[PDB]
Coordinates of C-alpha atoms and ligand atoms in Angstrom, one line a residue:
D1 CA 1.0 -19.8 -9.2
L2 CA -0.4 -22.9 -7.4
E3 CA -2.4 -20.7 -4.9
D4 CA -4.2 -18.9 -7.9
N5 CA -5.2 -22.2 -9.6
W6 CA -6.2 -23.5 -6.2
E7 CA -8.7 -20.6 -5.8
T8 CA -9.8 -21.3 -9.5
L9 CA -10.9 -24.8 -8.3
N10 CA -12.7 -23.8 -5.1
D11 CA -14.7 -20.8 -6.7
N12 CA -15.7 -22.9 -9.8
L13 CA -17.0 -25.6 -7.5
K14 CA -19.4 -23.0 -5.9
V15 CA -20.6 -22.3 -9.5
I16 CA -21.4 -26.1 -10.0
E17 CA -23.1 -26.2 -6.5
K18 CA -25.6 -23.5 -7.7
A19 CA -25.8 -24.6 -11.5
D20 CA -29.1 -25.5 -13.1
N21 CA -28.3 -26.8 -16.6
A22 CA -25.4 -29.1 -17.9
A23 CA -23.9 -26.2 -20.0
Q24 CA -23.2 -24.3 -16.7
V25 CA -21.5 -27.4 -15.2
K26 CA -19.6 -28.1 -18.5
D27 CA -17.9 -24.6 -18.8
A28 CA -17.0 -24.7 -15.0
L29 CA -15.3 -28.1 -15.2
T30 CA -13.5 -27.1 -18.4
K31 CA -11.8 -24.2 -16.5
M32 CA -11.1 -26.6 -13.5
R33 CA -9.5 -29.1 -15.9
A34 CA -6.9 -26.7 -17.4
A35 CA -6.3 -25.4 -13.8
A36 CA -5.2 -28.8 -12.3
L37 CA -3.1 -29.5 -15.4
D38 CA -0.7 -26.4 -15.0
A39 CA -0.9 -26.9 -11.1
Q40 CA 0.6 -30.4 -11.7
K41 CA 3.5 -28.6 -13.4
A42 CA 4.0 -26.6 -10.2
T43 CA 5.8 -27.5 -6.9
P44 CA 4.0 -27.6 -3.4
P45 CA 5.1 -25.3 -0.5
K46 CA 6.8 -28.1 1.6
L47 CA 8.8 -29.6 -1.3
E48 CA 10.9 -26.5 -2.3
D49 CA 14.2 -28.6 -2.6
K50 CA 12.8 -31.9 -4.0
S51 CA 13.8 -33.0 -7.6
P52 CA 10.8 -33.2 -10.0
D53 CA 11.6 -37.0 -10.1
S54 CA 11.5 -37.7 -6.3
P55 CA 8.8 -40.0 -4.9
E56 CA 7.4 -36.9 -3.0
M57 CA 6.8 -34.8 -6.2
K58 CA 5.5 -37.9 -8.0
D59 CA 2.9 -38.4 -5.2
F60 CA 2.0 -34.7 -5.7
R61 CA 1.5 -35.1 -9.5
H62 CA -0.4 -38.4 -9.0
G63 CA -2.8 -36.5 -6.7
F64 CA -4.0 -34.1 -9.4
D65 CA -4.1 -37.0 -11.9
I66 CA -6.9 -38.5 -9.7
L67 CA -8.5 -35.0 -9.5
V68 CA -8.5 -34.8 -13.4
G69 CA -10.1 -38.3 -13.4
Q70 CA -12.9 -37.2 -10.9
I71 CA -13.5 -34.1 -13.2
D72 CA -13.3 -36.4 -16.4
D73 CA -16.2 -38.6 -14.9
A74 CA -18.2 -35.5 -14.1
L75 CA -17.6 -34.1 -17.6
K76 CA -18.8 -37.5 -19.1
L77 CA -22.1 -37.2 -17.0
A78 CA -22.7 -33.5 -18.1
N79 CA -22.2 -34.4 -21.8
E80 CA -24.8 -37.2 -21.3
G81 CA -27.2 -34.6 -19.9
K82 CA -27.1 -35.7 -16.2
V83 CA -26.7 -32.5 -14.1
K84 CA -27.6 -33.8 -10.5
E85 CA -25.1 -36.7 -11.0
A86 CA -22.3 -34.4 -12.5
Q87 CA -22.6 -32.2 -9.4
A88 CA -22.1 -35.2 -7.1
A89 CA -18.9 -36.3 -8.9
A90 CA -17.6 -32.6 -8.7
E91 CA -18.0 -32.7 -4.8
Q92 CA -15.1 -35.2 -4.8
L93 CA -12.7 -32.2 -5.3
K94 CA -13.3 -31.3 -1.5
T95 CA -11.5 -34.7 -0.6
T96 CA -8.4 -33.8 -2.7
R97 CA -8.7 -30.2 -1.5
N98 CA -8.6 -31.3 2.2
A99 CA -5.8 -33.9 1.3
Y100 CA -3.6 -31.1 -0.2
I101 CA -3.9 -28.6 2.8
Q102 CA -3.1 -31.4 5.3
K103 CA 0.0 -32.6 3.4
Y104 CA 1.6 -29.3 2.2
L105 CA -0.1 -26.4 4.0
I106 CA -0.6 -27.5 7.6
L107 CA 2.7 -26.9 9.5
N108 CA 1.8 -27.9 13.1
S109 CA 5.0 -27.3 15.2
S110 CA 3.2 -27.3 18.6
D111 CA 5.3 -28.0 21.8
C112 CA 4.9 -24.3 22.9
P113 CA 2.0 -23.0 20.7
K114 CA 0.7 -19.4 21.1
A115 CA 4.1 -18.5 22.6
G116 CA 4.9 -14.7 22.7
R117 CA 1.3 -14.0 21.8
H118 CA 0.7 -11.2 24.2
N119 CA -2.0 -8.4 23.8
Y120 CA 0.5 -5.5 23.9
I121 CA 2.7 -6.8 20.9
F122 CA -0.2 -6.8 18.4
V123 CA -0.7 -3.0 19.3
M124 CA 2.9 -1.8 20.1
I125 CA 4.8 -3.2 17.0
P126 CA 2.3 -1.9 14.2
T127 CA 2.2 1.6 15.9
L128 CA 6.1 1.7 15.9
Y129 CA 6.2 0.4 12.3
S130 CA 3.9 3.2 11.2
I131 CA 6.4 5.8 12.5
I132 CA 9.5 4.0 11.0
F133 CA 7.8 3.8 7.6
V134 CA 6.4 7.5 7.4
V135 CA 9.6 9.1 9.1
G136 CA 12.0 7.0 7.0
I137 CA 10.2 7.5 3.6
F138 CA 10.4 11.3 3.9
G139 CA 13.8 11.1 5.6
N140 CA 15.6 9.0 3.0
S141 CA 13.9 10.7 0.0
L142 CA 15.3 14.0 1.3
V143 CA 18.8 12.3 1.5
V144 CA 18.6 11.3 -2.2
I145 CA 17.8 15.0 -3.1
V146 CA 20.7 16.3 -0.9
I147 CA 23.2 13.8 -2.5
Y148 CA 22.2 14.8 -6.1
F149 CA 22.1 18.7 -5.4
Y150 CA 24.4 19.5 -2.4
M151 CA 27.0 16.6 -2.9
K152 CA 26.3 16.4 -6.7
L153 CA 27.7 12.8 -6.7
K154 CA 31.4 14.0 -7.0
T155 CA 32.9 11.6 -4.5
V156 CA 33.1 7.8 -4.0
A157 CA 31.5 8.2 -0.5
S158 CA 28.5 10.0 -2.1
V159 CA 27.7 7.0 -4.4
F160 CA 27.7 4.5 -1.4
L161 CA 25.7 7.0 0.8
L162 CA 23.1 7.2 -2.1
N163 CA 22.8 3.4 -2.4
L164 CA 22.2 3.0 1.4
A165 CA 19.3 5.5 1.0
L166 CA 17.8 3.4 -1.8
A167 CA 18.4 0.1 0.1
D168 CA 16.8 1.6 3.3
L169 CA 13.9 3.0 1.1
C170 CA 13.3 -0.5 -0.5
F171 CA 12.9 -2.2 2.9
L172 CA 10.6 0.6 4.1
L173 CA 8.3 0.0 1.1
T174 CA 7.6 -3.5 2.5
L175 CA 7.2 -2.4 6.2
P176 CA 3.3 -1.8 6.2
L177 CA 2.9 -5.4 5.1
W178 CA 4.7 -6.7 8.2
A179 CA 2.9 -4.0 10.4
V180 CA -0.7 -5.3 9.6
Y181 CA 0.6 -9.0 9.8
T182 CA 1.5 -8.3 13.5
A183 CA -1.7 -6.3 14.0
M184 CA -3.8 -9.2 12.7
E185 CA -2.1 -11.4 15.3
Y186 CA 0.4 -13.0 12.8
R187 CA -2.2 -13.5 10.0
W188 CA -0.8 -13.0 6.4
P189 CA -3.5 -11.9 4.0
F190 CA -1.1 -11.1 1.0
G191 CA -0.6 -14.7 -0.4
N192 CA 2.6 -16.6 -1.3
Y193 CA 4.2 -14.1 -3.8
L194 CA 4.4 -11.3 -1.3
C195 CA 5.3 -13.6 1.5
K196 CA 8.5 -14.5 -0.5
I197 CA 9.3 -10.9 -1.8
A198 CA 8.5 -9.2 1.6
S199 CA 10.7 -11.7 3.5
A200 CA 13.5 -11.4 0.9
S201 CA 13.3 -7.6 1.2
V202 CA 14.0 -7.8 5.0
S203 CA 16.9 -10.2 4.4
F204 CA 18.3 -8.0 1.5
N205 CA 18.4 -4.9 3.7
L206 CA 20.8 -6.5 6.2
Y207 CA 23.3 -7.8 3.5
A208 CA 23.3 -4.6 1.3
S209 CA 23.7 -2.4 4.3
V210 CA 26.6 -4.6 5.8
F211 CA 28.3 -4.5 2.3
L212 CA 27.8 -0.7 1.8
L213 CA 29.0 0.0 5.4
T214 CA 32.2 -2.1 4.7
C215 CA 32.8 -0.1 1.4
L216 CA 32.4 3.3 3.1
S217 CA 34.8 2.2 5.9
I218 CA 37.5 1.1 3.4
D219 CA 36.9 4.4 1.5
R220 CA 37.4 6.4 4.8
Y221 CA 40.5 4.4 5.7
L222 CA 42.1 5.0 2.3
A223 CA 41.1 8.7 2.2
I224 CA 42.5 9.6 5.7
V225 CA 45.3 7.0 6.3
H226 CA 46.7 6.4 2.8
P227 CA 46.0 9.4 0.4
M228 CA 47.0 9.0 -3.2
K229 CA 46.5 10.7 -6.7
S230 CA 42.7 10.9 -7.0
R231 CA 41.8 9.6 -10.5
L232 CA 38.1 10.5 -10.1
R233 CA 37.0 9.1 -13.6
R234 CA 38.4 5.6 -12.6
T235 CA 37.4 5.8 -8.9
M236 CA 33.8 6.8 -9.8
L237 CA 33.7 3.9 -12.3
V238 CA 34.8 1.3 -9.7
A239 CA 32.4 2.7 -7.1
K240 CA 29.4 2.5 -9.5
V241 CA 30.3 -1.2 -10.5
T242 CA 30.9 -2.2 -6.7
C243 CA 27.4 -1.1 -5.9
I244 CA 25.8 -3.2 -8.7
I245 CA 27.8 -6.2 -7.4
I246 CA 26.5 -5.4 -3.8
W247 CA 22.8 -5.4 -5.0
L248 CA 23.6 -8.7 -6.8
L249 CA 25.4 -10.3 -3.7
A250 CA 22.6 -9.2 -1.3
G251 CA 20.1 -10.4 -3.9
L252 CA 21.8 -13.8 -4.1
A253 CA 22.3 -13.9 -0.2
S254 CA 18.5 -13.4 0.2
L255 CA 17.6 -16.3 -2.3
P256 CA 16.7 -18.8 0.6
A257 CA 13.8 -16.5 1.6
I258 CA 12.5 -16.6 -2.0
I259 CA 12.9 -20.5 -2.0
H260 CA 11.8 -21.8 1.6
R261 CA 9.3 -19.0 2.6
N262 CA 5.6 -20.0 2.1
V263 CA 2.1 -19.3 3.6
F264 CA 1.1 -22.1 6.0
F265 CA -1.9 -22.9 8.4
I266 CA -1.8 -23.9 12.1
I267 CA -4.9 -18.6 10.9
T268 CA -2.2 -18.3 8.1
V269 CA 1.5 -17.5 8.8
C270 CA 4.3 -16.3 6.5
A271 CA 7.1 -18.6 7.7
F272 CA 10.3 -20.4 6.7
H273 CA 10.2 -24.1 6.1
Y274 CA 13.0 -26.3 7.6
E275 CA 14.1 -29.5 5.9
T276 CA 21.2 -31.0 11.2
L277 CA 21.2 -28.6 8.1
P278 CA 20.2 -25.2 9.7
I279 CA 23.1 -25.6 12.3
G280 CA 25.7 -25.7 9.4
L281 CA 23.9 -22.8 7.6
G282 CA 23.2 -20.5 10.7
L283 CA 26.9 -20.6 11.5
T284 CA 27.8 -19.5 7.8
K285 CA 25.6 -16.3 8.0
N286 CA 27.3 -15.1 11.3
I287 CA 30.9 -15.7 10.1
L288 CA 30.0 -13.7 6.8
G289 CA 27.3 -11.2 7.6
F290 CA 28.5 -10.0 11.1
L291 CA 31.8 -11.4 12.2
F292 CA 33.9 -10.8 9.0
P293 CA 32.6 -7.3 8.0
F294 CA 32.5 -5.8 11.5
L295 CA 36.1 -7.0 11.8
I296 CA 37.1 -5.1 8.5
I297 CA 35.0 -2.0 9.6
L298 CA 36.6 -1.7 13.1
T299 CA 40.2 -2.1 11.7
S300 CA 39.4 0.7 9.1
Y301 CA 37.9 3.0 11.8
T302 CA 40.4 2.3 14.5
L303 CA 43.1 3.5 12.1
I304 CA 41.1 6.5 10.7
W305 CA 39.7 7.9 14.0
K306 CA 43.3 7.8 15.5
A307 CA 44.7 9.7 12.5
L308 CA 41.8 12.3 12.6
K309 CA 41.0 12.8 16.4
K310 CA 43.5 15.8 16.3
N311 CA 35.7 14.3 4.6
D312 CA 35.5 14.6 8.5
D313 CA 31.8 15.7 8.4
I314 CA 31.3 12.6 6.1
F315 CA 33.4 10.4 8.5
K316 CA 31.1 11.6 11.4
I317 CA 28.0 10.5 9.3
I318 CA 29.6 7.1 8.2
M319 CA 30.8 6.5 11.9
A320 CA 27.3 7.3 13.4
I321 CA 25.5 5.0 10.8
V322 CA 28.1 2.2 11.5
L323 CA 28.0 2.6 15.4
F324 CA 24.2 2.6 15.6
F325 CA 23.8 -0.2 13.1
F326 CA 25.9 -2.7 15.1
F327 CA 24.7 -1.7 18.6
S328 CA 21.0 -2.2 17.4
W329 CA 21.6 -5.7 16.0
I330 CA 23.1 -7.1 19.3
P331 CA 19.6 -7.6 21.1
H332 CA 18.3 -9.6 18.1
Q333 CA 21.7 -11.5 17.8
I334 CA 21.3 -12.9 21.3
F335 CA 17.6 -14.0 21.0
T336 CA 18.1 -15.4 17.4
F337 CA 20.7 -17.8 18.9
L338 CA 18.3 -18.5 21.8
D339 CA 15.4 -19.2 19.3
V340 CA 17.8 -21.8 17.6
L341 CA 18.2 -23.5 21.0
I342 CA 14.4 -23.9 21.2
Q343 CA 14.1 -25.2 17.6
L344 CA 16.9 -27.9 18.3
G345 CA 15.7 -29.2 21.7
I346 CA 18.5 -27.8 24.0
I347 CA 16.0 -25.5 25.9
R348 CA 12.7 -27.3 26.0
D349 CA 10.8 -24.9 28.4
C350 CA 7.6 -22.9 27.3
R351 CA 8.4 -20.4 30.2
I352 CA 11.7 -19.5 28.5
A353 CA 10.3 -20.0 24.9
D354 CA 7.7 -17.3 25.8
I355 CA 10.4 -14.7 26.9
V356 CA 12.3 -15.3 23.5
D357 CA 9.1 -15.3 21.4
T358 CA 7.8 -12.1 23.1
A359 CA 11.2 -10.2 22.7
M360 CA 12.0 -11.2 19.1
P361 CA 9.3 -8.8 17.5
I362 CA 10.7 -5.9 19.7
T363 CA 14.4 -6.9 18.8
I364 CA 13.8 -7.2 15.0
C365 CA 12.2 -3.7 15.2
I366 CA 15.4 -2.1 16.8
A367 CA 17.7 -4.1 14.3
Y368 CA 15.7 -2.5 11.4
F369 CA 15.0 0.9 13.2
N370 CA 18.1 2.4 11.4
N371 CA 16.2 2.6 8.1
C372 CA 14.3 5.6 9.6
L373 CA 17.2 6.9 11.8
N374 CA 20.0 6.9 9.2
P375 CA 18.7 10.1 7.4
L376 CA 18.7 12.0 10.8
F377 CA 22.5 11.3 11.0
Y378 CA 23.0 13.9 8.2
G379 CA 22.7 16.7 10.8
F380 CA 26.5 16.9 10.9
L381 CA 26.3 18.6 7.5
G382 CA 23.5 21.1 8.8
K383 CA 25.8 24.1 9.4
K384 CA 27.5 23.7 5.9
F385 CA 24.1 22.9 4.2
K386 CA 22.4 26.1 5.6
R387 CA 25.4 28.0 4.2
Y388 CA 24.7 26.5 0.7
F389 CA 20.8 26.9 0.9
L390 CA 21.1 30.6 1.7
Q391 CA 23.7 31.2 -1.0
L392 CA 21.4 29.5 -3.5
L393 CA 17.9 31.2 -3.0
Ligands
ZD7_401 C1 11.4 -6.2 10.4 C2 10.2 -6.5 9.6 C3 9.5 -7.7 10.1 C4 9.8 -9.0 9.6 C5 9.1 -10.2 10.1 C6 8.2 -10.1 11.1 C7 7.9 -8.7 11.7 C8 6.9 -8.4 12.8 C9 7.5 -8.7 14.1 N1 8.5 -7.6 11.1 C10 7.5 -11.3 11.7 C11 8.5 -12.5 11.8 C12 9.1 -12.7 10.5 O1 9.4 -14.0 10.1 N2 9.4 -11.6 9.6 C13 10.0 -11.7 8.3 C14 11.5 -11.9 8.2 C15 12.0 -11.9 6.9 C16 13.5 -12.1 6.7 C17 14.4 -12.2 7.8 C18 15.8 -12.4 7.5 C19 16.7 -11.4 8.0 C20 18.2 -11.7 7.7 C21 18.6 -12.8 7.1 C22 17.7 -13.8 6.6 C23 16.3 -13.6 6.8 C24 15.4 -14.7 6.4 N3 15.2 -15.2 5.1 N4 14.2 -16.1 5.2 N5 13.6 -16.2 6.5 N6 14.4 -15.3 7.2 C25 13.8 -12.2 9.2 C26 12.4 -12.0 9.4

């Protein structure tokens, strides 16, 4: 970690600034020397897709070579006995330190700064996120118990309904991180590792859900419209493998968040770094993660609802999770496209930019509100579940 070695340099400089003898300066500069050596092996936050041979990365590596040199002169002075002089040469780290934050950490976008930074958002969103997390954690963990004991994982539908609980449960585990981020007025105090994992976990939830909701739709279509000899041993085998592949595809689809997300200054923010290219990539996610599956899902359900309006309790559950999921993503879908128009230069108006940046935290809340609401859609099984509960004990 570059951020870790960067803290190793700043804290060891404070040791040198208060050091009395040369032995205190020697041991501090030795730790700093090894720190800048493996930090040279690393890649800065703004050069995520730059070959370790490009003039950009070479300028990064050369930067720490000068830093090693400044430390090497200070070590030479400490070995001679000069403490007051070794401390002066160590203070040259602050130049390289301020040169690194201005080159790779300051991401000044300006144009419409402090947009969507209203007093009610920093209070409304963390209070709403507290509820989604707490309600959803107890909700989905009860769903996992119900699937293992009431459903006993005997159907194909049961397997996908369990995986959706785990996927929803995973996203929920990262929710208090995004709650305090908003409460601290978009200040990220968890570093670079959690900025990447917490952003990839939000991305992963969308893809895995969309993939599971497609699988459950096809399952409902084939169960109701085209029934065939149920070879459970083979159907359970294919359903178990399909879910592994889903977690793999959603993992691979959320890889950009692990690559281009970093912590940057303006107050630190956990944001995506843009290299023309996002236009031809933002069009690829819509035609795969919303237009293509919702097309497959609707075709399955238009055929199944028609053949059932005159397994069904499960269909009600799968239909309610599918209908709510897509009607909650529409607000965010409109404003995400509108945010793209701000980032390009089509709509260059801070009055409009504010309306979009004040609504996006509210729209991303509703588009992820299903993780706490999905367990509540199991109420269709309530009359049959109380029948099992009483018969048990
Ligand atoms: C709902 C919790 C959540 C998140 C959040 C903020 C908030 C508080 C309003 N709450 C602040 C804004 C922000 O960037 N975040 C993180 C985020 C991470 C991933 C995605 C995402 C979703 C689908 C597909 C791709 C991505 C993606 N990958 N990399 N960058 N975006 C969107 C937002």
